Symmetry: D3
Subunit: 132 residues, 6 copies
């Protein structure tokens, strides 16, 4: 039933004034905020931990540089089937109706991260909320 998932609101959301728009979409599907931190600039080690599965890719450093270019919010959301449901809400830039489908048009500047699995959720929550 109940799950917790990790969401990042990305620097481009701040730049484009879409923070509340994104949070509102998750809130409207009835998911609750369990933990939340605002980072004026997230420490790079946290970002590199978060994206460690990508450490070998050509885009790794550039993506980290983006994620450090402005503020981030890290949020733990709770609700039924939260991991998959918030992943679906995130969507992609090809799918209207979703956060990325309605609001994003870039492979990197895509507004929001949501955990993609039970395993990744557990790990991302411990990165951003280790006092847990």
């Amino acid at each position: 039933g109940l799950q917790r998932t990790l969401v990042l609101i990305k620097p481009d959301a701040f730049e484009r004034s879409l923070v509340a728009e994104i949070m509102g979409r998750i809130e409207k599907k009835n998911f609750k905020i369990v933990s939340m931190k605002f980072w004026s600039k997230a420490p790079r080690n946290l970002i590199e931990q978060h994206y460690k599965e990508h450490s070998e890719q050509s885009y790794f450093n550039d993506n980290c540089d983006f994620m450090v270019s402005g503020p981030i919010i890290s949020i733990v959301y709770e609700g039924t089937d939260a991991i998959s449901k918030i992943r679906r809400l995130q969507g992609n830039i090809l799918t209207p109706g979703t956060i990325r489908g309605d609001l994003a048009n870039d492979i990197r500047e895509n507004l929001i991260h949501a955990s993609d699995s039970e395993d990744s959720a557990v790990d991302e929550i411990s990165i951003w909320f280790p006092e847990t």
Copy 2:
């Protein structure tokens, strides 16, 4: 082209203050209200009749309990291809862009019913609007 369909706004929509949000999505798709009733509490007999096709399912009684747990609005909507279009608007909890997709996250508490066929529409309209 022109059809009529039956919509129920469920008790969870009242509890969560989403009645206008739901009705607004249908209105914006250019469907028109032909008939509408507000029930502070719907008669259990009407609920059991509405969900008669589910009477042998494990969830039948609990669902009926939920459907009488608060107010409901029954609406007849009219427009081109209304039955399937409003069904598509209803959607499901997995599909963002739809009413249930954007707003609901429960197998039972899912905000809206819309008729799924011509036969069920005629039957459901008859139930809520016997006049």
Copy 3:
């Protein structure tokens, strides 16, 4: 504390697809629907009763004709200080922020009626909801 007020959603709201927009504004201020009726065309006697205080004015018949030109919803709303608060939400065509201020621009086609006093509320509710 708690009051009930009578709201009419006018034919122009139907014509312009603003029914839910208007109802949403009242719902968002936390007022609850206690009674509601949809009228494909309201009987004229009800409209003339509703506007009886205006029976002598030059605009009486024309206003009644408008109120009968399309569907109406009659709603009883309940909440703290409902009469005055919903009156304020209705507002007027000069006051942005209000239903009429944001959405209406006519002396007659102004989308919504809300009871203006305790006395008028009691009387309007009994017109539209006599089985009460």
Copy 4:
């Protein structure tokens, strides 16, 4: 891949006061206006050229009639993958989440046109914005 595409806001959008709603959906996806013309009533020749590929279909003249029945806005939008993305945003009357999916319910009165290919985009831009 930066692209430019042609959008028409149709007379039904003006009639239904949905012009800003439509433009806003495109604006929110980060597409930029490159040029724009308002036509209180579009010259018929421009409409016939626009739908030239449809001249042998039974609906051609009634569709043209509709397209001159009220104002039109023609817009050149620019952005990454604009042709395909704005086409997707336009969507269809069956798919909620899109402009047509949320707002339209007719085969003819469907609110918006967006170029469907690189070739048609070049051609449609030359019709509405020959300069």
Copy 5:
């Protein structure tokens, strides 16, 4: 009393993706577009004429600079009491419920201009729409 008024959507509205939001507030009040021009960068002369009455103020040239720092839309709107009503809709940065009250927070970068009188409306329309 049917009137026509001149509206400018300013470069900050384009920068902040608020063009449709602004136009939508006017559209929802039932005002109609009579003409519209998009300016990727407005000719400076047009801007200097528009703010001619301010030519002796200290902010004149910096204000002009801002007004050519990005695109502009000039619109002629029509409706009952349009000059006063659209002026009121524009509002000020202190008053929530209005365009500037909800969306702007600067003396210069304030999103929208609306004609403030019958005389200025006639004059502003002649600048932007001389034809």
Copy 6:
């Protein structure tokens, strides 16, 4: 011009799912989040300190009870004239167009606190963000 102010999102905003709606209104007015904390339950001592100027009022204890009845968000916002502008956005339950005017209808459960002066802002920021 530039100021910082302290905002609390109150427990009733969480209960009614209005957190983003409230934050969205401030964001749209171009104010920026400088600091933010989520409290699943705020320490009563912090609440009593925040409302210290009310300690001799009849409603003090009940208000504190309410303020610890659910989660709160404390936010420092920054922008031009932030203290009074965000105060104006907060508004009151009588004034439509504002946060409390559109969304609240209670003397206690009123969704948002915003600092009302420079002195109270410095003091309130110090309370919630002692760092």
